[PDB]
Short mmCIF file of C-alpha atoms and ligand atoms in Angstrom, two decimals:
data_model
loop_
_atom_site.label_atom_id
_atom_site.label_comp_id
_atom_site.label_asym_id
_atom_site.label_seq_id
_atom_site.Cartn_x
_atom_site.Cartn_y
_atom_site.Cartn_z
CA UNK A 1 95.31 -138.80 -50.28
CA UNK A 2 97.45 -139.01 -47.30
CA UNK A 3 98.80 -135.82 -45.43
CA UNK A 4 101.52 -136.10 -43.07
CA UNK A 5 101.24 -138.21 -40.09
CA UNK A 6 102.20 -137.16 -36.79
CA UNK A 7 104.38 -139.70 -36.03
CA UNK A 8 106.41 -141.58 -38.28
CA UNK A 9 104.64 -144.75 -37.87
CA UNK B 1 95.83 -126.17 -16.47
CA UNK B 2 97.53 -123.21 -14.62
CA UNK B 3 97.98 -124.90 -11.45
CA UNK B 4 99.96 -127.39 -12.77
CA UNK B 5 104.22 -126.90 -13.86
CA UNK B 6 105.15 -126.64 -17.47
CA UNK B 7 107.57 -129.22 -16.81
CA UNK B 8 104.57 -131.65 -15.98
CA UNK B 9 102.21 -130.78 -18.06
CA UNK B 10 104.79 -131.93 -20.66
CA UNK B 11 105.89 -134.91 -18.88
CA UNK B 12 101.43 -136.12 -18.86
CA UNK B 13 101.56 -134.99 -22.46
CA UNK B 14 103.89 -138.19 -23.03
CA UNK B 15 102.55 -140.13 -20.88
CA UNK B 16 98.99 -139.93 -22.63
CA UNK B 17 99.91 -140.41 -26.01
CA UNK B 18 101.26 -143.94 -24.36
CA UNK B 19 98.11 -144.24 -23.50
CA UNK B 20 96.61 -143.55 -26.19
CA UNK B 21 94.73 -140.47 -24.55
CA UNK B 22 94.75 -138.16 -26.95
CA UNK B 23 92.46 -135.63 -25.42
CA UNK B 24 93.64 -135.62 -22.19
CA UNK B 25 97.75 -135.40 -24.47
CA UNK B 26 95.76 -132.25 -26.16
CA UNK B 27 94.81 -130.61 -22.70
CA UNK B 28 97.70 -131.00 -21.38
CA UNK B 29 100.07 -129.02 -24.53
CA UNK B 30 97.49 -126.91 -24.48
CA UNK B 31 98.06 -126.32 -20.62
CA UNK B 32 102.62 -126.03 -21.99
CA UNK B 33 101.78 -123.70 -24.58
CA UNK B 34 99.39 -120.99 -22.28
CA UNK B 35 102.67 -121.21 -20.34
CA UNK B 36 103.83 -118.09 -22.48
CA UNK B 37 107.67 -119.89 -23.12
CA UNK B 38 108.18 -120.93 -26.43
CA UNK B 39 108.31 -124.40 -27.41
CA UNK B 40 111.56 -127.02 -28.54
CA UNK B 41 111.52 -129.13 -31.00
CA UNK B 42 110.01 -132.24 -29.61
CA UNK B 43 107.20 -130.10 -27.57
CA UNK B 44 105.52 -128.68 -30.87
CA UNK B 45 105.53 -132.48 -32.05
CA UNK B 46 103.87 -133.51 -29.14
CA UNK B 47 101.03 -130.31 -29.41
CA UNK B 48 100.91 -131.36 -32.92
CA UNK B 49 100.35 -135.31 -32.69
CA UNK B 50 97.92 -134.66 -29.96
CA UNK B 51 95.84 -132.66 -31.99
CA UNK B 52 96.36 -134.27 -35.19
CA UNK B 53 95.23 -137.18 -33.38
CA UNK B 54 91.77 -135.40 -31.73
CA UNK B 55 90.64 -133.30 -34.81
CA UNK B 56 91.60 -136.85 -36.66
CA UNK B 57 88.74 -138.88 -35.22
CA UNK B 58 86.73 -136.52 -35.17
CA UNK B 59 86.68 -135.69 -39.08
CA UNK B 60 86.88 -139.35 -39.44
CA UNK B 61 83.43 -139.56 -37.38
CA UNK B 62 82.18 -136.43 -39.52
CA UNK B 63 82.82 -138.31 -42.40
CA UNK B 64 80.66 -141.15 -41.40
CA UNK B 65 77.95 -138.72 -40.71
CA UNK B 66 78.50 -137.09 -43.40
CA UNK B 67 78.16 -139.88 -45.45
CA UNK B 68 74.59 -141.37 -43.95
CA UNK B 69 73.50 -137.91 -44.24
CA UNK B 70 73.56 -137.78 -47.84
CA UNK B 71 72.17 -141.63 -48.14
CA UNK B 72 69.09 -139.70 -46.52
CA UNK B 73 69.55 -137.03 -48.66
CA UNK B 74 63.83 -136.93 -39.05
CA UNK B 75 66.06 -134.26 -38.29
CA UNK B 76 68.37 -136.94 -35.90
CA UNK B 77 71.21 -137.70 -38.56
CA UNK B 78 71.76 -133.94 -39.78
CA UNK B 79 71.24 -132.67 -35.58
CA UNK B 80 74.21 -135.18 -34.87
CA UNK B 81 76.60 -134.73 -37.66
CA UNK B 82 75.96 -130.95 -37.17
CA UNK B 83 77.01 -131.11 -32.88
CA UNK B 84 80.73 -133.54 -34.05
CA UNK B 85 81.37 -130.35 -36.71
CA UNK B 86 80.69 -127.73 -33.85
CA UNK B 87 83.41 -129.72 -32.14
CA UNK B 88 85.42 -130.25 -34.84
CA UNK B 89 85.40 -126.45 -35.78
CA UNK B 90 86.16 -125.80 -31.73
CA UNK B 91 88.74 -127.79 -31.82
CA UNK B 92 90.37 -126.15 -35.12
CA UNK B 93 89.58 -122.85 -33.46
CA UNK B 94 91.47 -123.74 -30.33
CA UNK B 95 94.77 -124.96 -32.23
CA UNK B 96 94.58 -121.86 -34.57
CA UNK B 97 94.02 -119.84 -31.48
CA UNK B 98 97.28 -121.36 -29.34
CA UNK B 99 98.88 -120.73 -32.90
CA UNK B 100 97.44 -116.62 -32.72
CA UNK B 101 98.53 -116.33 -28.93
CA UNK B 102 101.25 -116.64 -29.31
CA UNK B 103 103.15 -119.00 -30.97
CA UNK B 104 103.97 -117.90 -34.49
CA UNK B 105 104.89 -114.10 -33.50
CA UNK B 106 107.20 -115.85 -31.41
CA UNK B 107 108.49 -118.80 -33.77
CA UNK B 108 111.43 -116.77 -35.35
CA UNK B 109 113.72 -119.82 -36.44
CA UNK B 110 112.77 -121.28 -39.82
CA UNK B 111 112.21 -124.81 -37.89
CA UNK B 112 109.48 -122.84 -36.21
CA UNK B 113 108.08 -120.84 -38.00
CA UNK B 114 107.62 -122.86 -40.59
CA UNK B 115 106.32 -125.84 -38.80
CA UNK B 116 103.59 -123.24 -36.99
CA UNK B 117 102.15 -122.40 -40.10
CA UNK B 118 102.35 -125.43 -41.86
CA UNK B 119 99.96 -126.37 -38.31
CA UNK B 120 97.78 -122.73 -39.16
CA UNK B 121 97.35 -124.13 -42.94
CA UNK B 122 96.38 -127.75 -41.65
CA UNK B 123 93.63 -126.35 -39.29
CA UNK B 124 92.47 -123.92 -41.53
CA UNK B 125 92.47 -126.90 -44.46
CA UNK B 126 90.22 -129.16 -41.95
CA UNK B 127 87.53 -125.88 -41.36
CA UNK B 128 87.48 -126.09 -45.09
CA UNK B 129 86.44 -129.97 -45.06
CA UNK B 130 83.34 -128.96 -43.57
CA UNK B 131 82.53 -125.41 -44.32
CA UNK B 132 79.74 -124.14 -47.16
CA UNK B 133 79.47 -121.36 -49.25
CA UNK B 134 80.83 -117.97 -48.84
CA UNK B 135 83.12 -117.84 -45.34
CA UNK B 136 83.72 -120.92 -47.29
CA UNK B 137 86.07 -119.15 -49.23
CA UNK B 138 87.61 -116.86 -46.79
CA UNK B 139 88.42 -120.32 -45.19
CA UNK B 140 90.52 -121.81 -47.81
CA UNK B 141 92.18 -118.42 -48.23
CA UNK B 142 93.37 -118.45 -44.86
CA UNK B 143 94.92 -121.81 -45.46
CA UNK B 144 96.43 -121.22 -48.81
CA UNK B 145 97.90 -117.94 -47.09
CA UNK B 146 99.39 -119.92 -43.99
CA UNK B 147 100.86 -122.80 -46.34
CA UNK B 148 102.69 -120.08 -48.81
CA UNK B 149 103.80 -118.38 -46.58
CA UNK B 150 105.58 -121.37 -44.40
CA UNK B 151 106.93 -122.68 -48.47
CA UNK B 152 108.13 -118.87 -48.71
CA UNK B 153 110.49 -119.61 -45.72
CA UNK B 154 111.05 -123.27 -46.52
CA UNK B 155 112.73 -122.69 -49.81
CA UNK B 156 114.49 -120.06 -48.32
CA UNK B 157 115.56 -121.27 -45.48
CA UNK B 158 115.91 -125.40 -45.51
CA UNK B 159 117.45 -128.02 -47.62
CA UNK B 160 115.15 -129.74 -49.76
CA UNK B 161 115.41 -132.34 -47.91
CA UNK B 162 114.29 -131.38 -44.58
CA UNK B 163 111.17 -133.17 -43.31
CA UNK B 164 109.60 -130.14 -42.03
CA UNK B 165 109.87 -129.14 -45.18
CA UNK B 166 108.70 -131.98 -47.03
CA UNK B 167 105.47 -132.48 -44.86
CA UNK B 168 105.02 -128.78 -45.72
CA UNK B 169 104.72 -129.56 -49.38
CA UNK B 170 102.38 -133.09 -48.67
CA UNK B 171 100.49 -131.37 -47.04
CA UNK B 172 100.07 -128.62 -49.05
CA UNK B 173 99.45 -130.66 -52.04
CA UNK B 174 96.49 -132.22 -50.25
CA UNK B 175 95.07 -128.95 -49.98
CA UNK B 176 95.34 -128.46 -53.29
CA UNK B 177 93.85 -131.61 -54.45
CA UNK B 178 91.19 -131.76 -52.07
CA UNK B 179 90.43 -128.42 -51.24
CA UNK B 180 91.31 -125.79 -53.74
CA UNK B 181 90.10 -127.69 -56.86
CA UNK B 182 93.57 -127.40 -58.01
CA UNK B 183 94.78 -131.53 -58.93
CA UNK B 184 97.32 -129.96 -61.40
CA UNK B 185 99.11 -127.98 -58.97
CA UNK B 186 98.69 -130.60 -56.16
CA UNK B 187 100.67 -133.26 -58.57
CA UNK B 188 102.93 -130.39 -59.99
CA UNK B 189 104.07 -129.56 -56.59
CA UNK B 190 103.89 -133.33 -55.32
CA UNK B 191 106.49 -134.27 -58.01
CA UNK B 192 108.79 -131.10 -57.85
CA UNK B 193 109.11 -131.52 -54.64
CA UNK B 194 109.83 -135.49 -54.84
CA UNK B 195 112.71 -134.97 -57.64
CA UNK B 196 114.30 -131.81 -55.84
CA UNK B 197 115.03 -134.17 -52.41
CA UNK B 198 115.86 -136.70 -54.40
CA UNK B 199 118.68 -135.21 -55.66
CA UNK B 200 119.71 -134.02 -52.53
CA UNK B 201 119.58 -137.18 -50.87
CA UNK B 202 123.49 -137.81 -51.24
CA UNK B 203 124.07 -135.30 -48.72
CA UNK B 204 122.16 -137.07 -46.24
CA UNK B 205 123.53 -139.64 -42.69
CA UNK B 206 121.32 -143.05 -42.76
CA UNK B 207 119.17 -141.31 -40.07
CA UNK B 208 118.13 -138.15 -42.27
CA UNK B 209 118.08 -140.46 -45.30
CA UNK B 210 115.38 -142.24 -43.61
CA UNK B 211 113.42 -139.38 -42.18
CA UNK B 212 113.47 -137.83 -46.06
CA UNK B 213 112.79 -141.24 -47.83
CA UNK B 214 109.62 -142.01 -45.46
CA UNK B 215 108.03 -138.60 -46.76
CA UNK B 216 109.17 -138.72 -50.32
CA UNK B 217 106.91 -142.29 -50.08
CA UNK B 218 103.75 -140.21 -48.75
CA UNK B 219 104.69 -138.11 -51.79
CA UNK B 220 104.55 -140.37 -54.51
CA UNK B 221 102.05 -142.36 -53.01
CA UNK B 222 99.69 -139.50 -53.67
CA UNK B 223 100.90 -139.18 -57.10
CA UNK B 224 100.15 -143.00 -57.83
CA UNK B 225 96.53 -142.13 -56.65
CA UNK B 226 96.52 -138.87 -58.18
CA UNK B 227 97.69 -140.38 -61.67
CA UNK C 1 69.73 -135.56 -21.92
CA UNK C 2 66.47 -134.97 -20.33
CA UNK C 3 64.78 -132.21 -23.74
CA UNK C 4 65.75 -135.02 -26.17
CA UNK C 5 63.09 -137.47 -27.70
CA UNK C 6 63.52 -141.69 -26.47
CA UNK C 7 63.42 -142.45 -30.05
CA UNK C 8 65.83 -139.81 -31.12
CA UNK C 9 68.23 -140.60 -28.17
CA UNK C 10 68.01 -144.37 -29.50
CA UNK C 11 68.75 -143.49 -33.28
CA UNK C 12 71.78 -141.11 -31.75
CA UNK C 13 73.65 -144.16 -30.55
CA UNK C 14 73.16 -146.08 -33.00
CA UNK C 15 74.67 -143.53 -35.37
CA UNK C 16 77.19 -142.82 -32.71
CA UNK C 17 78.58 -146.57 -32.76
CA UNK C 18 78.75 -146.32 -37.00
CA UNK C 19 81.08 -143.34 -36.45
CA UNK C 20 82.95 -144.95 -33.51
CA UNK C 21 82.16 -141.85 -30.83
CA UNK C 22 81.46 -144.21 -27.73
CA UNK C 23 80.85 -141.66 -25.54
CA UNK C 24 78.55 -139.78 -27.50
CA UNK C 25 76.78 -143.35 -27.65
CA UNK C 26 77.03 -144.08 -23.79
CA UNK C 27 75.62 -140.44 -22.96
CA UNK C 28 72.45 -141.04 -25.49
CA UNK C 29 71.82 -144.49 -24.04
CA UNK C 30 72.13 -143.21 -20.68
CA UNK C 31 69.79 -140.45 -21.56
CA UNK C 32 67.32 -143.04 -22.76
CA UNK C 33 67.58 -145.33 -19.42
CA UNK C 34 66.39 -142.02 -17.73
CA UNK C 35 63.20 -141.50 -19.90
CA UNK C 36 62.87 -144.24 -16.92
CA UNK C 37 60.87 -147.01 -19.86
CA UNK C 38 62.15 -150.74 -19.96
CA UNK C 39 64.66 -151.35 -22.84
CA UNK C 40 64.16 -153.75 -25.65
CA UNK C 41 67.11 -156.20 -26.01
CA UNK C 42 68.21 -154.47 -29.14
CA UNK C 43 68.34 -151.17 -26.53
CA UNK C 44 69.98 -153.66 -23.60
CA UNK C 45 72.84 -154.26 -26.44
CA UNK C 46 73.09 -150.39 -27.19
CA UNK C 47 73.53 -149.42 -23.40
CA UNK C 48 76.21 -152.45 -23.06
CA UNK C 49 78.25 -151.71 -26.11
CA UNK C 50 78.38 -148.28 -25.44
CA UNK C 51 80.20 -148.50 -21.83
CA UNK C 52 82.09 -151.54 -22.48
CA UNK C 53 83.90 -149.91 -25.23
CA UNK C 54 84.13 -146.71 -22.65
CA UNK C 55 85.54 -147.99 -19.81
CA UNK C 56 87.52 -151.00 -21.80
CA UNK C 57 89.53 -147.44 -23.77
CA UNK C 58 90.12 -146.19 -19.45
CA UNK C 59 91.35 -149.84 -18.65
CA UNK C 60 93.72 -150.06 -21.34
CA UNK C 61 95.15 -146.96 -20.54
CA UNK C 62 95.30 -147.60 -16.61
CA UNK C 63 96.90 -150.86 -17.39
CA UNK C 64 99.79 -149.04 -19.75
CA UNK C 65 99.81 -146.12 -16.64
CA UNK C 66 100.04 -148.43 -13.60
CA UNK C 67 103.05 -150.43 -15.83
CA UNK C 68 104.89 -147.73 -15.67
CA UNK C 69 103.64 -146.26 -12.49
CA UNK C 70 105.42 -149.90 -11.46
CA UNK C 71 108.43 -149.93 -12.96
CA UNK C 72 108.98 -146.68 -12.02
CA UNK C 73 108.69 -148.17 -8.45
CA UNK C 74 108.37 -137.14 -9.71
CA UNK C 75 104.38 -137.78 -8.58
CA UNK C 76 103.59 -137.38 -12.25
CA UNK C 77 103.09 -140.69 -13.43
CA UNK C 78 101.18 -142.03 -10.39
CA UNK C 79 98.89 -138.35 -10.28
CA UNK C 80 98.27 -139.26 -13.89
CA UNK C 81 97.36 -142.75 -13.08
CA UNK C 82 94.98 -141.73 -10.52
CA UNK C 83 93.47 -139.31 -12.87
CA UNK C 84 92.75 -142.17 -15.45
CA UNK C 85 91.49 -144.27 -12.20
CA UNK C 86 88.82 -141.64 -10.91
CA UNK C 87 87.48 -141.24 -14.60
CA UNK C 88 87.11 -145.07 -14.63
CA UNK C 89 85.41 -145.25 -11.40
CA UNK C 90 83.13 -142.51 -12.10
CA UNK C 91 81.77 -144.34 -15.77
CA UNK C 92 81.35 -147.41 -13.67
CA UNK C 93 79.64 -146.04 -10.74
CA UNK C 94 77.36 -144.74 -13.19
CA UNK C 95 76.85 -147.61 -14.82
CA UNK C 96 75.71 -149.52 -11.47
CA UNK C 97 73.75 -146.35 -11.07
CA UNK C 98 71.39 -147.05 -14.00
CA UNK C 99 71.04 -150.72 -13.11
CA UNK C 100 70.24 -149.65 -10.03
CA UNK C 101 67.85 -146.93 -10.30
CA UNK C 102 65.74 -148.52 -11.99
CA UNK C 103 66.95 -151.43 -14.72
CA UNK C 104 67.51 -154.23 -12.34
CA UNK C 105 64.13 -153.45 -10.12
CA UNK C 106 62.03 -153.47 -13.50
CA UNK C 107 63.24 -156.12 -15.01
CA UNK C 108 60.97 -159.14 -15.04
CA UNK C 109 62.02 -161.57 -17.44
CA UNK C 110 64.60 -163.89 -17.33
CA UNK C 111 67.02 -162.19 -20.50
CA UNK C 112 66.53 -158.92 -19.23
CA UNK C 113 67.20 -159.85 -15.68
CA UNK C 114 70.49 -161.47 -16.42
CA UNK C 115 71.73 -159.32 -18.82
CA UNK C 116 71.24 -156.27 -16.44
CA UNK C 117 72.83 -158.50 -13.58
CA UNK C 118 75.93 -159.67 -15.54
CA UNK C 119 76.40 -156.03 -16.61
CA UNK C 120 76.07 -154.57 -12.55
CA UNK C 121 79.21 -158.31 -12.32
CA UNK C 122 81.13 -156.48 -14.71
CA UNK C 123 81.10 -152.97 -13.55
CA UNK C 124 81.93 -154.06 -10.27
CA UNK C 125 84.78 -156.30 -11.64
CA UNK C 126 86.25 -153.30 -13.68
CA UNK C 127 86.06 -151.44 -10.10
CA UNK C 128 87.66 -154.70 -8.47
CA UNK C 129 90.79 -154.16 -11.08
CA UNK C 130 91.97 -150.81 -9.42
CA UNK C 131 90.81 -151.04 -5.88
CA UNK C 132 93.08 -152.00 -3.07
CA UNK C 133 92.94 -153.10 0.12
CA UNK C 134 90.00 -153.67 2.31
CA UNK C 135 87.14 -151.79 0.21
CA UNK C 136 88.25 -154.36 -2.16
CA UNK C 137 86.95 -157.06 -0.72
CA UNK C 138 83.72 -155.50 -0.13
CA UNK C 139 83.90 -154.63 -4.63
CA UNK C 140 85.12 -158.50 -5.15
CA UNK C 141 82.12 -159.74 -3.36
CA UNK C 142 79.48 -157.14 -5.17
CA UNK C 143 80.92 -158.66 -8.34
CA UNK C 144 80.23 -161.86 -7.07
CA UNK C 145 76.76 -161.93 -5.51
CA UNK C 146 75.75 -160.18 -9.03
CA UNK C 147 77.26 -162.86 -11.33
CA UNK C 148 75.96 -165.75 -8.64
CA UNK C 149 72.57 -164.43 -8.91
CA UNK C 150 72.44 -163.95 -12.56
CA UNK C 151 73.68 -168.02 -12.96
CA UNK C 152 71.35 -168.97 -10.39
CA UNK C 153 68.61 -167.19 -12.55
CA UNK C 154 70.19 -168.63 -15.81
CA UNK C 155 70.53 -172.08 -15.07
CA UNK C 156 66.81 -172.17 -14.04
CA UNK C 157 65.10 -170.30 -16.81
CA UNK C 158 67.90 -170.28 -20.20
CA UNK C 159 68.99 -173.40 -21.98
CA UNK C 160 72.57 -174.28 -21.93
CA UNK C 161 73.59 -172.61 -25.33
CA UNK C 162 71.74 -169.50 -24.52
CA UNK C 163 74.15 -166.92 -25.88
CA UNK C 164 73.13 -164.29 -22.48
CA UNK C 165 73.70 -167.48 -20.13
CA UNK C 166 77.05 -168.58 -22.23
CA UNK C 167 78.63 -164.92 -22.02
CA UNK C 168 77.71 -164.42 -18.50
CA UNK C 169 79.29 -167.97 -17.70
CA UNK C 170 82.16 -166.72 -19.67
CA UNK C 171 82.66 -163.49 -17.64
CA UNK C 172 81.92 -165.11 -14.55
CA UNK C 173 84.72 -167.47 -15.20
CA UNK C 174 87.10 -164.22 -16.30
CA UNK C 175 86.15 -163.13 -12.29
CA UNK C 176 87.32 -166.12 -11.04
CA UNK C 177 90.67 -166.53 -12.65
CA UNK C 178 91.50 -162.62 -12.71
CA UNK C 179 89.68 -161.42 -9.70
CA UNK C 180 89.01 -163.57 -7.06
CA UNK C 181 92.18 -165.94 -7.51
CA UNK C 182 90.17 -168.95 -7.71
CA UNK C 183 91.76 -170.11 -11.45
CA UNK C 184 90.57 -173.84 -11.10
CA UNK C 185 86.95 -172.50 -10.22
CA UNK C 186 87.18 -170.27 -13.72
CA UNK C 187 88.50 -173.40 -15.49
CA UNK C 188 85.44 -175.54 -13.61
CA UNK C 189 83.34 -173.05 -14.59
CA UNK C 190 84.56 -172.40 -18.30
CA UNK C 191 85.09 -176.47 -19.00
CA UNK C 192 81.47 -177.16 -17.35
CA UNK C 193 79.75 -174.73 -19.69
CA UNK C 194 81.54 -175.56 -22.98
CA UNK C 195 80.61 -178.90 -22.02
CA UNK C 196 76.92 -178.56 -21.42
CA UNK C 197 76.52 -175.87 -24.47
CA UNK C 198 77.87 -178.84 -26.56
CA UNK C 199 75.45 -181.33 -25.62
CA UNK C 200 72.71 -178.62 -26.55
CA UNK C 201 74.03 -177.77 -30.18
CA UNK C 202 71.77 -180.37 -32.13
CA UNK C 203 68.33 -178.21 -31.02
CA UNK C 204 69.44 -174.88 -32.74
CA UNK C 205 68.75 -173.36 -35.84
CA UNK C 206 71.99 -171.88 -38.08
CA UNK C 207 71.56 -168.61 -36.45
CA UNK C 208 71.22 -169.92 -32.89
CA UNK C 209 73.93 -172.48 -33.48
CA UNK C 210 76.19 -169.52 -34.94
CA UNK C 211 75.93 -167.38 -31.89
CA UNK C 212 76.39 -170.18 -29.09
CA UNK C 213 79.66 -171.50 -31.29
CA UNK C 214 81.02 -168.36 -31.06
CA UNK C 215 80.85 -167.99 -27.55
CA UNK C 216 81.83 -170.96 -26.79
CA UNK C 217 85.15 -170.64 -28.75
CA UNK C 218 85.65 -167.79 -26.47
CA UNK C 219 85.27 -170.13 -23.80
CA UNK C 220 88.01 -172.93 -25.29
CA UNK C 221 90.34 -169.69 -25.88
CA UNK C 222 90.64 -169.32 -22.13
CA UNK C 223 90.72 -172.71 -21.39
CA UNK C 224 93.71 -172.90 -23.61
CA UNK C 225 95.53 -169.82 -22.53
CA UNK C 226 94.88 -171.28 -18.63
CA UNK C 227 96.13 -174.59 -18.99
CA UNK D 1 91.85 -164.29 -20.41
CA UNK D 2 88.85 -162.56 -22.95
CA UNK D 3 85.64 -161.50 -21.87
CA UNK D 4 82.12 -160.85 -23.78
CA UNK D 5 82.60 -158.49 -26.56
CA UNK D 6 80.23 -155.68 -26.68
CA UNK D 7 79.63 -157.01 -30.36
CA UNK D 8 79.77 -160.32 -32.54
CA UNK D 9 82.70 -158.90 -34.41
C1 LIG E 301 104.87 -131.44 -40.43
C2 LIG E 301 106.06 -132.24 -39.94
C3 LIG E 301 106.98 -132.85 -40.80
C4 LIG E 301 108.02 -133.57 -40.23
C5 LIG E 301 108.12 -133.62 -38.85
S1 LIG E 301 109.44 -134.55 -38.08
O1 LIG E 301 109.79 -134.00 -36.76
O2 LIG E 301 110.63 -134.44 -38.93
N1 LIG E 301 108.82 -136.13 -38.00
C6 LIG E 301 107.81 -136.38 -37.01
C7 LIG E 301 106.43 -136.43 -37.60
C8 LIG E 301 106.22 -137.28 -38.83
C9 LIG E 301 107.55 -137.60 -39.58
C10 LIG E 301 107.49 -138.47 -40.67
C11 LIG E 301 108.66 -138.78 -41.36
C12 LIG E 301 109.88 -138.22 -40.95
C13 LIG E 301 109.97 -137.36 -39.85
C14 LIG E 301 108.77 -137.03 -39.16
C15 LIG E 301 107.22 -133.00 -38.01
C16 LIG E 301 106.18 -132.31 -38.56
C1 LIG E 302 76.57 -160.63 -22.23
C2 LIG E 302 75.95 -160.92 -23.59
C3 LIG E 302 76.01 -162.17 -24.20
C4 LIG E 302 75.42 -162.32 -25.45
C5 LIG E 302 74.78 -161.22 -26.01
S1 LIG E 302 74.02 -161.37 -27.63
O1 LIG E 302 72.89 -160.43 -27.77
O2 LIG E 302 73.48 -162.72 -27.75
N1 LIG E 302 75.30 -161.04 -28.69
C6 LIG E 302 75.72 -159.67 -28.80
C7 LIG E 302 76.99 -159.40 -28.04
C8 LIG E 302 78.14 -160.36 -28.22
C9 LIG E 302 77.69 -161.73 -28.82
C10 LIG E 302 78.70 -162.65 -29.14
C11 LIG E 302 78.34 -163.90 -29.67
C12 LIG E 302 76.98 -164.19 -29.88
C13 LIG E 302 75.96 -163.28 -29.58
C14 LIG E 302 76.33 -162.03 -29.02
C15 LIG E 302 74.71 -159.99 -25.39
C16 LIG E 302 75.30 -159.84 -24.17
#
């Protein structure tokens, strides 16, 4: 599962 | 770093994530925040995609380790995955410790505050990846107390919309999923929190729609996995 | 380095390539030159991997610094750039320090001899990249009288498809174009190689042939992209 | 203008 990345690419 | 201004510590902090230095990116916040002044908006993104970005590969490389380990079920494959968790678990202590001294006392805005512990559950949540047993536990405490606390705020405080807000609950579902042996809260929360900025997407410019809509997509890309 | 085992040290970077931590892997291999024993070719290939992928991460990064440092025309960005450029000049000085002290000295046959020479070519070309001036020459012409000696060695003892003679042709020819400003000696060089390799082909096996095709594509790629 | 990769890949 993905958590948020920290940018939003 | 405290020879060096706060004003260019921040301006090396962008220069090395276009570079792709993430350490040296990491250093450097580190170096802004031990400055004492609080942070804006775009500095606690940078401290958070530099770290992100360290602890990142290194939980990637753990993972490998990890993995080869267990394949084995000499002493060279468990010495080596054991020195990139002692760094791992530095680095996570040095985040949670910027976040202890002092930015979260200080973080009184929602934004903030908020954001800071959503960062305190996240490092907590990657101690947990690699932690045994007993402290174990106290571990995944500490991050289910940081994320419920910054949800506390966020549904207080912030539209349901707001991508702080909505990384929050991502992220939190993660933890719950991966961590806290809990996939029917992870999905609960996953979808309640999908359908609730849904229908607040009307109130939304293009710009905000597009900020929402990229995180609702992390969101129900979980679910498809998850279901 | 200097309480670990050889053998442990060895096993260390090769785990530290699976999980992508190139440093780790270039401080084990350099720990291993120092037990001050030859290296097998599989151990040659180990040492090399391990600082190319090192100092190719600091020259991407000083290339994406010095553009900006350029079109720029505060001291941040070149202070930053020079930070980058010292930590890339150290790696390679202590690259040429191994081969040096003792790789080079002990090195009898002809495969190990090259390798180790093409290797002390390329450190000093990466150190040719950011130099300036005067000093530069004096780097341009190190690179040089390492790659010259390791062809004169090649071309006497390795057969034309040789994939240690073939790779050092093809970095020798990457010297000439980007370094020393002699482009129709690198295309000389490049065609003149290809060429001979070709003529070879028929006498390998599907391994051999496998390897020396691939370099030699490599070859054809910058004969394309320089004329 | 490519050099030697450190592996076949
Ligand atoms: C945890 C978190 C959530 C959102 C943001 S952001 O500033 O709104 N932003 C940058 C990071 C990733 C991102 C993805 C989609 C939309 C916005 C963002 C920061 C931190
Ligand atoms: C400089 C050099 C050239 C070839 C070799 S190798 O051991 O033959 N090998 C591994 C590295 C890259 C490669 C590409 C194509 C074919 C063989 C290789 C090592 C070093």
């Amino acid at each position: 599962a993905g958590s948020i990345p920290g940018r939003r690419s | 770093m405290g020879s060096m201004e706060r004003a260019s510590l921040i301006q090396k902090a962008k220069l090395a994530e276009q570079a792709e230095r993430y350490e040296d990116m990491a250093a450097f916040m580190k170096g802004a925040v031990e400055k004492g002044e609080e942070l804006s908006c775009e500095e606690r993104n940078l401290l958070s995609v530099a770290y992100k970005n360290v602890v990142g590969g290194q939980r990637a490389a753990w993972r490998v380790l990890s993995s080869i380990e267990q394949k084995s079920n000499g002493p060279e494959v468990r010495e080596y995955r054991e020195k990139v968790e002692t760094e791992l678990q530095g680095v996570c202590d040095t985040v949670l410790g910027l976040l202890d001294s002092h930015l979260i006392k200080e973080a009184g805005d929602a934004e903030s505050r908020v954001f800071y512990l959503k960062m305190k559950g996240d490092y907590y949540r990657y101690l947990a990846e690699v932690a045994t047993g007993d402290d174990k536990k106290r571990i995944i405490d500490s991050a289910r107390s940081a994320y419920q606390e910054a949800m506390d705020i966020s549904k207080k405080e912030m539209p349901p919309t707001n991508p702080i807000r909505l990384g929050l609950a991502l992220n939190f579902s993660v933890f719950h999923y991966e961590i806290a042996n809990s996939p029917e809260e992870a999905i609960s929360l996953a979808k309640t929190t999908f359908d609730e900025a849904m229908a607040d997407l009307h109130t939304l410019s293009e710009d905000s729609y597009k900020d929402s809509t990229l995180i609702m997509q992390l969101l129900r890309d979980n679910l498809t996995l998850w279901t």
